[PDB]
């Protein structure tokens, strides 16, 4: 192999691949990054059975097409340290060399047959996304998912043309449906189960404009510049759509914002809150503070709500503040029941259709008293 | 007590108090501030046996005059969360409240009395220093760190306050002269710790006094008084370990330097530095096997040198030697590759500290 290559484009590509090396252990080949110079382009690749990312970048030469490896985190570490001109990146036995004018650089390689080989899929489902609704779905639930419940769910029903996405621990359980979405599938009702670790991965990487496809064992997500692959998780996701509460006794349009902000002063002396809706105000006590330890605010609300006997609900602070960042409206509708009953977070107008963005509604599990 | 209080001006003199505070047990006064009205100010403080700092802000009402303690901690998590409005802030029984139009809080105040008194001293020593010299000189110090600190050592003979820190391998100092020192002996030595050295960063730039009987430090500005114990006794004699003379000097660049060690130290803690007439070139030395980095710049102004000085340096060591550094050259000072070496400024000889490094090398 030798080539001759741009700083910027080399590093960037470099950035993204160190999430899909084991670093610590610099001596096993999952520290390092398989390189391969066919034709005007250089294609770097971190994998393992479970994950993986293949990139390319384009050459300013190309002397000589070949294939080697290299440690990550050095590489990176090596190229981040260069000015900003040519890299001759160039094979010398069992070694590899990297060349900028006065700089010189020798790294040992392992053999490129024990690279692990990057799969490809006969999908059963496929779909292209033009739009960032997907990644705003799995950037909103993902808060709620700890590392079948391990990971974030992606439901096709090609029938309908809905993917649903669905995260949960026990406590609560966030998800939204994306309508009028074209579902390439080879049946009429499918659903992958994307790892955490691979979720955030995605995040990293990808926007709009990418293809998702699956063959119910693996994901591979696909742009112009990449090829990612997860492992999906084997299993059955519980049906979410049980435990939905039929129906809401109770419906309150109020400020998020301002309920953000009562939240995180409360909950500055507690991890849970006393909320009591009334009329024309909101009042938020700590809860499970210690005791002689005490924190209250109260806001107004100006537009009367519906109710004569005042309404009582404890919460996990934490939770309605994450249920409060993962909807882009100012204003939002809480649902509720019994005050022991699950309540749920939604959007404004959270029925309304939405071109760019997904909608998340998040169901949660209240305090006793 | 009962007073109102600007919500900034209370958020920032609680976050200076944070670091002054035990916060993993707060159920111990030590995880508290102290308070006290007195006039239309309000004082707080935190302290212990070796370290401290009483701050205070101006009250924009007063009423009650008294003490009080608080959690610091929980005290900056409740202001922190509020409006920019006035806090009103009033004890009811052994509770303080805090209030904010519709937001009130309670927390549980301990008994003022079990707070330690903060010390007075009768000063051996004092300065008052009205440029950003000596906090430059301890920013610049601090890195390389009895040998637990920072010692100044005051000349009142040559009007000279000489700081050094070092840890064996290498030492840095500057000698600050032209500084009206008043003291009451000849040379007297204190030496700061490190962790005091570290909160003196963050609170003091100039205009500020410093005082030490020979036990403590007391250090003091208009809106802070913050003390700290001295280390006891016997910093070693820097003087003993300088060089007379050096064989050669190296008047190199400053950043072309840095680039070229934190490159190579890419693959290894240590480099071999190869100087020549027109070159520099730095190598790798300790890198595992079959790893390798090299580069080189010009020296379009030709060094005094016959055949190539080779010499072995600590790459992170070198770093912050020129680190230190304010010029766009520095001059590397030496005599055989074996003995130790000293970086410092172009022009040292001369508002800021101009700080020297001696180094140990590396053999081979
Ligand atoms: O997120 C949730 N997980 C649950 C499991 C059982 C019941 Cl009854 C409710 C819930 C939630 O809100």
Redesign the pocket.
């Known amino acids: 192999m030798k080539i001759s290559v741009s700083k910027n484009d080399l590093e960037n590509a470099l950035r993204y691949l160190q999430a899909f090396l084991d670093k610590k252990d610099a001596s096993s080949i999952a520290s390092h990054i398989h390189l391969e110079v066919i034709k005007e382009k250089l294609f770097l690749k971190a994998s393992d059975s479970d994950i993986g990312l293949k990139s390319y970048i384009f050459t300013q030469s190309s002397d000589k097409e070949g294939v080697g490896t290299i440690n990550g985190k050095k590489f990176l570490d090596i190229i981040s340290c260069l000015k900003d001109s040519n890299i001759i990146l160039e094979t010398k036995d069992d070694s590899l060399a990297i060349k900028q004018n006065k700089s010189s650089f020798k790294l040992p390689m392992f053999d490129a047959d024990e690279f692990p080989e990057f799969p490809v899929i006969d999908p059963k489902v496929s779909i292209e996304v033009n739009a960032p609704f997907l990644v705003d779905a799995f950037k909103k639930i993902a808060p709620v998912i700890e590392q079948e419940l391990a990971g974030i769910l992606m439901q096709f029903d090609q029938k309908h043309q809905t993917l649903s996405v669905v995260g949960?621990d026990?406590?609560?359980?966030s998800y939204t449906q994306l309508e009028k979405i074209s579902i390439h599938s080879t049946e009429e009702d499918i659903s992958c189960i994307l790892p955490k670790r691979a979720l955030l991965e995605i995040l990293k990487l990808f926007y709009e404009n990418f293809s998702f496809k699956s063959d119910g064992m693996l994901a591979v997500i696909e742009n112009e510049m990449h090829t990612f692959f997860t492992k999906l998780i084997d299993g059955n996701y519980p049906d979410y759509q049980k435990?939905l509460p039929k129906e809401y006794i109770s419906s309150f349009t109020l400020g998020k914002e301002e309920f953000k902000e009562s939240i995180k002063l409360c909950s500055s002396l507690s991890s849970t809150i006393k909320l009591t809706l009334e009329k024309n105000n909101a009042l938020f006590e700590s809860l499970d503070s210690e005791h002689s330890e005490t924190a209250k605010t109260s806001v107004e609300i100006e537009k009367g709500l519906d109710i004569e006997k005042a309404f009582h609900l404890g919460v996990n602070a934490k939770f309605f503040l994450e249920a409060l960042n993962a909807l882009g409206t100012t204003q939002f509708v809480l649902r509720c029941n019994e005050p022991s009953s699950?309540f749920l977070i939604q959007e404004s107008l959270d029925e309304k259709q939405s071109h760019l963005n997904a909608k998340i509604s998040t169901?949660?599990?209240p305090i006793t008293l």
């Open positions: 949960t026990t406590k609560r359980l435990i699950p169901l949660m599990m």
